[PDB]
Design an enzyme around this catalytic site. Structure first.
Site, mmCIF file in Angstrom:
data_model
loop_
_atom_site.group_PDB
_atom_site.id
_atom_site.type_symbol
_atom_site.label_atom_id
_atom_site.label_comp_id
_atom_site.label_asym_id
_atom_site.label_seq_id
_atom_site.Cartn_x
_atom_site.Cartn_y
_atom_site.Cartn_z
ATOM 1 N N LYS A 85 36.200 52.934 -33.630
ATOM 2 C CA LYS A 85 35.509 53.821 -34.561
ATOM 3 C C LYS A 85 36.155 53.704 -35.926
ATOM 4 C CG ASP A 145 33.998 71.461 -35.809
ATOM 5 O OD1 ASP A 145 34.003 71.210 -37.035
ATOM 6 O OD2 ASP A 145 33.771 72.616 -35.374
#
Ligand SMILES: CC(=O)c1c(C)c2cnc(Nc3ccc(N4CCNCC4)cn3)nc2n(C2CCCC2)c1=O
Ligand SMILES: CC(=O)c1c(C)c2cnc(Nc3ccc(N4CCNCC4)cn3)nc2n(C2CCCC2)c1=O
Lengths: 302, 302
Positions: free
Chosen positions: B106, B234
């Site tokens: 990523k 989150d």
């Protein structure tokens, strides 16, 4: 524990691994002669046991030197191993030899590097022309090392001497008009390097047969004239003698590894192998004179 | 032909080769958490087919990440191969997966890197404490790439999903009060990523047995509380379902490669394997609330 040496080993290792991913072409382009690769390493709080924290490594014309290695029958993996598997050994109180005695690693000046760059194309073409059969130095790699402030240039060549067979006597001949003789400081080290007159004194003979002599001098003439043509001088013939009696094969050598070997002829007082090639060519009374003068000498001693 | 990707592959290759010369200690020192290695490459008129002429590559805390790899049962040679043997594949119209579907790569922000640095020691110690048994992301490598002006940061993690077994349905759950639903733009791609309410709608059940559920939630609680403790929030639970009926072993998985797999129980309407772990933790209404709220949700769906 010699930082410069470990950067060299690191550098050769890196160099050969990178090239292993590069396709080998059959031809060099003019740009290959202007090319280089540069690697700067900064290790912060890492890898202190092996490497310096800050070093630079630069290889000159990596494609040209790989092409030369191939032309001299050297495989990159072997060259990598000879230089990396274990440290090169220092040689005097200067140069290094690979732990397997196959390669010589000499420190040279930025002048020498500039001159090498200057003659490389012509040098390459010469090697192409003679199909790798020459008594010239075999230049295999050229690098710049930087270890925190210190900057050195190295060149790697094939050893003139055998990797197996020892050499009890070494000469270095130029055939010059001025007197050349060895130091007594040198004579007292296990293996001295004698010069023109140490030879021209104590009755040293080279016993090779008339075919071997013919081949050698034909080669020498071509080589030396090419050196002349480049306005190069101050080079030597490195002569090493192996006494079979003192020190697989019980006296024979691999002619594909020890390229500069010549057996003595059958009527030779002692069982001897000779190792002869040109060394130290990068110094740029005149070049054209030096050449024929050098050739006169080597003729008269063989 | 993606320059950034080839620097990454080049970088991982370089990284693992260097570490192969570094002795593996059983402990990390505090300095290993502040460490890095930096390599700047300048190729002039050389190696254009493979590499860019000018690139930088930086690895963060290489010793810490190698220690983590080892703790997650990953061998450096395998990790090297998975990332280098053939290019990683892009994934959307973003991230990459290794050609063997084992690792996720990523792109992250300098903020994310700063946060990773910030939590690494505590993260490492947590992994030590739970003996590598966790539903947290498995961070395996963290790098900075520079290709002539462009600068990107990447992190490498273990895939939550299986490298062999496909996954026909993917969820991403947070258990949040605000409504979460998938895009129709997403639904129309072969493999969509559904969210909280796509699940809380069309009657999705996870059929695992009561032991497997107990183990999972015990783990989840510990993991989530550790994330809370770090003031992190989150994050999602990534849920993937493999339908054995549609797509060696004729349905079973390697529990040592596909670590997040759980078989369904015997009375499960369909033959299913589930793949569940935490993802996306590096964002720093409150952390302590989020945690128990996340836990409430996952409990009520399992
Ligand atoms: C770059 C060169 O032209 C060159 C070559 C090709 C070369 C080849 N074999 C050598 N093989 C040798 C040369 C000398 C010894 N000795 C062993 C013990 N010490 C004294 C000499 C051993 N092996 N030495 C070589 N040198 C050396 C002489 C000048 C400094 C390096 C070289 O410049
Ligand atoms: C750094 C992470 O926390 C993380 C991890 C650990 C992870 C693990 N396996 C994944 N495995 C996945 C995740 C999603 C898919 N899809 C396949 C088709 N495209 C849509 C989803 C396939 N494999 N994906 C992961 N991600 C992705 C989600 C956000 C962007 C990367 C992650 O961030």
């Amino acid at each position: 524990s010699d930082p410069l040496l470990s950067v060299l080993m690191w550098g050769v290792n890196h160099s050969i691994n990178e090239l292993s991913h590069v396709q080998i072409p059959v031809m060099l382009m003019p740009d290959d002669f202007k090319a280089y690769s540069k690697i700067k390493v900064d290790n912060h709080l890492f890898n202190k046991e092996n490497m310096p924290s800050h070093f630079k490594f630069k290889e000159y014309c990596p494609m040209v030197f790989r092409n030369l290695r191939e032309r001299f029958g050297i495989d990159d993996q072997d060259f990598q191993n000879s230089l990396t598997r274990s440290a090169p050994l220092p040689n005097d109180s200067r140069f290094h030899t690979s732990y397997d005695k196959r390669y010589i690693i000499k420190t040279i000046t930025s002048e020498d590097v500039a001159e090498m760059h200057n003659i490389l194309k012509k040098y390459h073409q010469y090697i192409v022309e003679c199909h790798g059969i020459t008594l010239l130095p075999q230049f295999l790699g050229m690098y710049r090392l930087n270890v925190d402030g210190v900057e050195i240039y190295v060149i790697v060549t094939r050893n003139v001497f055998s990797h197996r067979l020892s050499v009890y006597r070494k000469y270095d001949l130029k055939g010059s008009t001025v007197a050349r003789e060895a130091s007594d400081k040198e004579k007292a080290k296990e293996l001295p390097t004698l010069k023109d007159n140490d030879f021209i004194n104590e009755g040293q003979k080279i016993y090779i047969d008339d075919n071997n002599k013919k081949v050698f001098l034909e080669k020498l003439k071509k080589d030396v004239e090419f050196l002349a043509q480049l306005k190069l001088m101050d080079y030597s013939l490195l002569v090493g003698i192996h006494d079979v009696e003192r020190a697989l094969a019980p006296g024979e050598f691999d002619p594909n590894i020890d390229v500069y070997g010549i057996k003595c002829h059958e009527n030779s007082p002692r069982k001897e192998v000779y190792f002869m090639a040109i060394i130290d060519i990068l110094t740029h009374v005149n070049p054209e004179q030096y050449s024929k003068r050098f050739l006169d000498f080597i003729g008269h001693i063989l």
